[PDB]
Write a protein that binds this ligand. Structure first.
Ligand SMILES: [Zn+2]
Lengths: 36, 49
């Protein structure tokens, strides 16, 4: 994996501290509210 | 005497047929105070200010 390579690659460079109805469309409705 | 009047509206509305049989023979809507009072203007129907 790319990530694994990148890791190994940097790990060698590391250092440490020393010791209803709608007339518009003609559709039929059922509620006055359903109309509005 | 029964009269069937339309509800005024402050906005465009679709129209639909209405069959009437009784009308007055002279103005009598004088008791009408104002239509759509809370809106800017009446678009359709009787407009009274
Ligand atoms: Zn419709």
């Amino acid at each position: 994996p790319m990530s694994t390579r990148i890791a190994e690659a940097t790990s060698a460079i590391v250092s440490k501290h020393p010791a209803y109805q709608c007339h518009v469309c003609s559709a039929v409705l059922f509620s006055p509210l359903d109309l509005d | 005497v029964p009269f069937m009047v339309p509800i005024s509206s402050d906005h465009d509305i679709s129209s639909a047929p209405a069959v009437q049989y009784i009308i007055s023979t002279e103005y009598n809507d004088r008791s009408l105070f104002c239509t759509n009072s809370s809106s800017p203007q009446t678009i359709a129907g009787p407009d009274k200010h």
